[PDB]
Amino acid sequence: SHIDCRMSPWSEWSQCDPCLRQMFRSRSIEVFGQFNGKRCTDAVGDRRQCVPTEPCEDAEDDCGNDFQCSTGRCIKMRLRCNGDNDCGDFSDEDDCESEPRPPCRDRVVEESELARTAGYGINILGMDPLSTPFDNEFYNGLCNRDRDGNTLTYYRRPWNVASLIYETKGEKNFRTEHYEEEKMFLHVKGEIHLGRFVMRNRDVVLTTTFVDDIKALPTTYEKGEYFAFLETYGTHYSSSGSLGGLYELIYVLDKASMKRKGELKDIKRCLGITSENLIDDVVSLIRGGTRKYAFELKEKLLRGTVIDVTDFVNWASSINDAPVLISQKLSPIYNLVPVKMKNAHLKKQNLERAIEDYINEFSVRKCHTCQNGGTVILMDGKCLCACPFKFEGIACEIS
Amino acid sequence: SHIDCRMSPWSEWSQCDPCLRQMFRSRSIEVFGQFNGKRCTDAVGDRRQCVPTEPCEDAEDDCGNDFQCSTGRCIKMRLRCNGDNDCGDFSDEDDCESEPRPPCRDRVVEESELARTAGYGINILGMDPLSTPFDNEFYNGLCNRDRDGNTLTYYRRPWNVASLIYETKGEKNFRTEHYEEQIEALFLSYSSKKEKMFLHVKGEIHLGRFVMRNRDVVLTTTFVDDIKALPTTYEKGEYFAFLETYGTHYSSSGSLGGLYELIYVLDKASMKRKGVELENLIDDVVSLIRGGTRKYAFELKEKLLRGTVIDVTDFVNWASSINDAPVLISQKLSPIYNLVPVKMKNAHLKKQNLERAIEDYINEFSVRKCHTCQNGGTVILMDGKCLCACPFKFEGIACEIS
Amino acid sequence: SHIDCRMSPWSEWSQCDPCLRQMFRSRSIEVFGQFNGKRCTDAVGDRRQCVPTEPCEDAEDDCGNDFQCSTGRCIKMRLRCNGDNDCGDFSDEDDCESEPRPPCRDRVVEESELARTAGYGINILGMDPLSTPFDNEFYNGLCNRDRDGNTLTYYRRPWNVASLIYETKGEKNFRTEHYEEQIEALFLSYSSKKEKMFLHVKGEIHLGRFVMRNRDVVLTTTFVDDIKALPTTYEKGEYFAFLETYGTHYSSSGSLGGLYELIYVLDKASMKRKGVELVNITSENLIDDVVSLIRGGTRKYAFELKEKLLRGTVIDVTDFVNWASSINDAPVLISQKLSPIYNLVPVKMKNAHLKKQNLERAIEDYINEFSVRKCHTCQNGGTVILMDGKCLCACPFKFEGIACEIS
Ligand SMILES: *[C@@H]1O[C@H](CO)[C@@H](O[C@@H]2O[C@H](CO)[C@@H](O)[C@H](O)[C@@H]2NC(C)=O)[C@H](O)[C@H]1NC(C)=O
Ligand SMILES: *[C@@H]1O[C@H](CO)[C@@H](O[C@@H]2O[C@H](CO)[C@@H](O)[C@H](O)[C@H]2NC(C)=O)[C@H](O)[C@H]1NC(C)=O
């Protein structure tokens, strides 16, 4: 049967760490859950506030030659009269003596909907409550810019974006492969690429929240607190990626079932069925584009219309409204630790430890194998099995 | 099992290099892991803040006979009050009290987006195009111009662009091959039926061709500042970070345009044999379109995935929109290190190190150090892991089965 | 195996060029990287800053009684005060404040774009046209008006272009060939059906020829400056970069025009084959291959015609005329007479002859150094092609692969 959560008490309770004023704790989680059994919900480490064991050492260094930005994110003093909110709170612009001289002194340029989102954090297991640690609204007082050819609108390239390239690149693929001696496969893939981005490797400007949480992390391997940070910002960020939207469909039969369910010439005529049912529940995936267009696309195609070229074009236009990531290269978020931060490298190593422990703990091997065979899966808080090869039950108990 | 990725140890720390106030370590990627081995997402470089051993030998230097802007670029005095932005800045222009004589002296002339974006940086891995290292708003106080041609409008050619012709070409190739064979006959007897058709359609539009000046080039202030920040001692991770920020090459010339292609292939067979001694089907269709605006490109993508003969109006609409959204349909690569300016501190040493960094980057991300495909499929170095693909029935994460 | 490309060792460093503050190295391309080896993208030459070992022998010269502009060009005094910009940045005209006299007395004259672009630079490697090295905005104080001919608009012929004649020509050339056979017959026996068709169509339009002036020719300031900024010693990479930015030749004459072309070929064969050794075979193969090309003219008409051309559709002459008329707006250099770019290196310049010779030699080495000759042979005698930094061959038959290694 399903297995309920199994847990341990906190195995440790720390000293009242000097700058933190907390007695942190560590516990363990023994079994999240299995076969849809009751997930665990407790934190893998508690903590307690406490009067600190010693005076805090932060003694924070002022910006000095840099502008004394209200949030402490020191900036080139020239950026006080930026007119550009290089400080976190316009205190640059407010401390300018009403001497506006914005970047793109004469030119007209906008801010990209996408570049604000560029440099997505990613939990390799999930997704992050704050999409980016990058503050993609810094410009260092430049106005590098790219043109959307679809509108001739210029957008500023925010300083963390080392490259931005809008590019129409449509791809579509349709494949069928079928043997009997017996199998059938049908595949459809549709990629609407929209643009490349690349993130700067150096001098990145982060959100004040992120550097505050880096100050909140101790130089100790505060494993549970490091995990709490990591779930705030993911295991990696994306340093390059392709944005836009995609859809994907497959239809798969036995070769004998293909000939009965079939005429392949009618299937092609639907590409370029009304008497059949089993053609209806094809696999379908849509990502990006405004949900209305994806819904009506599904409602037509699952009812087995021919391919509505106009609905596909309308969804592609909707991708301009609701773009999504198509592919990325990831880099671990510890690379974002500012090199001048106190104990920066130590915190970076403790982050690498946290990452490795994250992988080690949430590997599916924490749960049992299925009661007969097939695939074991981990859902968040509980494992399960799936066995589509004519097996059944929450553990594939039946075949 | 598959083999997960693996990495070397870290190097020792470098010395604490002056001015940059850091020490560094290096860590080669031993294996990416074929067979869907666990990815190596992790950084090859490490760096730590350090108090330097000795005073900073300043990277900054004087510009005597040249106006030193607020950006670090020093320009000939003739370019002050030139009316053009010659520094990525207006420190050359905001000072100006009088006689802002523009070098295009009372003639109408536009910017060209072809010129502004010309010279794209390129990562040789995947040929991914990148922002141009050149500053294409600098005109050296000249007024070289040519016509956009299809419209009778002149645009000003930026100093970094030595040529930019606007030749209209249209090309289109259409090829079809079809084969059917039947053979009938140890004593051996045959019944076999084979059917193959190959249909290949590709068409090209050329918008123009640029060529880059390569001596006296003027580069973005960010790019030269990043070269200043680059360490002299070949800290490989920092050089790889630079190469990924800017790519390893720039297009020193290329054609802008737009492209589309369509392939249809079918093989169908019924093979049998008997003898005396003492069905499979594959179809695939792929349509690719590059450049032009979304609407027309994707409408053609639909109308080309259909076998319907396209309306020439749609083709011409896409062709026109290619002027709005061209693609670098071809380029000639030049190594990015040639853009490293002479007359800069350790510039030649940095060039040496950049060449070594490009070598190591190509090697360190070589698929060559991934295990073979089982059935000889094309081995793919994806992000941090290796795999292979096979066209034949042999299939799976290494084509292990069939 | 693939064969990774290979390069020479660096040459020795040159001496420091006393005026150029620089020293240089050369590096031959030993092997291009056949069979999709490593690409040899690395630079053929390298240069290093040097504090010079001796004083510069200055590159400036005294033009004497000639006006010496803000740019290095020197011009005869009468060209001052022309109203025409006879030098860089009107410096010949900013030298003038009173009694301006345009040689186009009492009239306005159009600037011809075809004259402005005439004298295209050319690189022999793909015959790509580069920009004209000529300064076609120099009239030398003349007002030679010519008609556009396709239009009555009169334009002032610039001094460099000795002739621009709208010697209009139009051509259409058409050929079709059709061949068909049916043949019916240890030993081998076969019966066959065979059909061959070829169709070839090209049309040319000529808008006119330019002839560049043999003598007294005035060049752009950047061109002459780039000849000044040249090592005087032979320095493979520095002259190669010059030829790469200007081309090894210029059109001393050329015809502007437009061109379209359509090729259609069909080959169809049917074979039946039976063999006996001291088998029965049936085969059908069809090959159908169509290519359509248009060059010049405005995109709208060029592409509309080219699509209507590619289809079996009969072209309405009105659209063909609209394209041929738009060729007046966007011509293409359909032909040229090539002169070596070093013939533009002006006599009466410091080391002029030596730089001529050095460019001659650099062009020699450039032809040689990027010669496909040193690629490996094709395995099936297909055409070896030098790509950017890698070399291969292609073959049209069933023998196929990156070197046609299989069939
Ligand atoms: C040699 O092979 C021929 C095919 O490869 C074969 O022709 C076939 O004959 C069938 C009747 O026996 C007929 O139904 C089928 O259409 C077919 N025809 C063609 C054009 O392929 C010949 O009969 C065979 N020769 C002998 C002597 O058996
Ligand atoms: C030359 O071009 C004209 C214009 O396209 C063609 O004129 C057509 O002539 C046919 C009869 O030959 C008529 O049926 C059409 O109505 C005409 N069209 C127009 C617009 O007038 C003419 O046919 C062409 N001739 C040749 C030999 O190609």
UniProtKB/Swiss-Prot annotation, chain B:
CDD domains: LDLa. GO terms for cellular component: blood microparticle; extracellular exosome; extracellular region; extracellular space; membrane attack complex; other organism cell membrane; plasma membrane. Its main location: secreted. Thrombin cleaves factor C9 to produce C9a and C9b. Phosphorylation sites are present in the extracellular medium. Pfam families: Ldl_recept_a (PF00057), MACPF (PF01823), TSP_1 (PF00090). It is found in: Secreted; Target cell membrane. Disulfide bonds join 5-40, 16-50, 19-56, 63-74, 69-87, 81-96, 104-143, 370-386, 373-388, 390-399. Residues 61-98 form the LDL-receptor class A domain. Residues 4-57 form the TSP type-1 domain. Changing residue 286 to C: Creates an artifactual disulfide bond that prevents the conformation change required for oligomerization and pore formation. Plasma (at protein level). One of its GO terms (biological process) is protein homooligomerization. Membrane attack complex (MAC) assembly is inhibited by CD59, thereby protecting self-cells from damage during complement activation. CD59 acts by preventing incorporation of the multiple copies of C9 required for complete formation of the osmolytic pore. MAC assembly is also inhibited by clusterin (CLU) chaperones that inhibit polymerization of C9. Specifically inhibited by the antibody aE11, thereby inhibiting MAC assembly. It is a multi-pass membrane protein. Keywords: Age-related macular degeneration, Complement alternate pathway, Complement pathway, Cytolysis, Disease variant, Disulfide bond, EGF-like domain, Glycoprotein, Immunity, Innate immunity, Membrane, Membrane attack complex, Phosphoprotein, Secreted, Signal, Target cell membrane, Target membrane, Transmembrane, Transmembrane beta strand. SUPFAM superfamilies: Growth factor receptor domain (SSF57184), LDL receptor-like module (SSF57424), TSP-1 type 1 repeat (SSF82895). Glycans are attached at residues 10, 13. InterPro entries: Growth_fac_rcpt_cys_sf, LDL_receptor-like_sf, LDLR_class-A_CS, LDrepeatLR_classA_rpt, MAC_perforin, MACPF, MACPF_CS, TSP1_rpt. Residues 100-369 form the MACPF domain. PROSITE patterns: EGF_1, EGF_2, LDLRA_1, LDLRA_2, MACPF_1, MACPF_2, TSP1. Gene3D superfamilies: Laminin (2.10.25.10), Low-density Lipoprotein Receptor (4.10.400.10), Thrombospondin type-1 (TSP1) repeat (2.20.100.10). It is linked to Complement component 9 deficiency: A rare defect of the complement classical pathway associated with susceptibility to severe recurrent infections predominantly by Neisseria gonorrhoeae or Neisseria meningitidis. Some patients may develop dermatomyositis. Macular degeneration, age-related, 15: A form of age-related macular degeneration, a multifactorial eye disease and the most common cause of irreversible vision loss in the developed world. In most patients, the disease is manifest as ophthalmoscopically visible yellowish accumulations of protein and lipid that lie beneath the retinal pigment epithelium and within an elastin-containing structure known as Bruch membrane. Pore-forming component of the membrane attack complex (MAC), a multiprotein complex activated by the complement cascade, which inserts into a target cell membrane and forms a pore, leading to target cell membrane rupture and cell lysis. The MAC is initiated by proteolytic cleavage of C5 into complement C5b in response to the classical, alternative, lectin and GZMK complement pathways. The complement pathways consist in a cascade of proteins that leads to phagocytosis and breakdown of pathogens and signaling that strengthens the adaptive immune system. Homooligomer; about 20 C9 chains oligomerize to give rise to a huge beta-barrel that forms a 100 Angstrom diameter pore in target membranes. Component of the membrane attack complex (MAC), composed of complement C5b, C6, C7, C8A, C8B, C8G and multiple copies of the pore-forming subunit C9. Belongs to the complement C6/C7/C8/C9 family. This is Complement component C9.
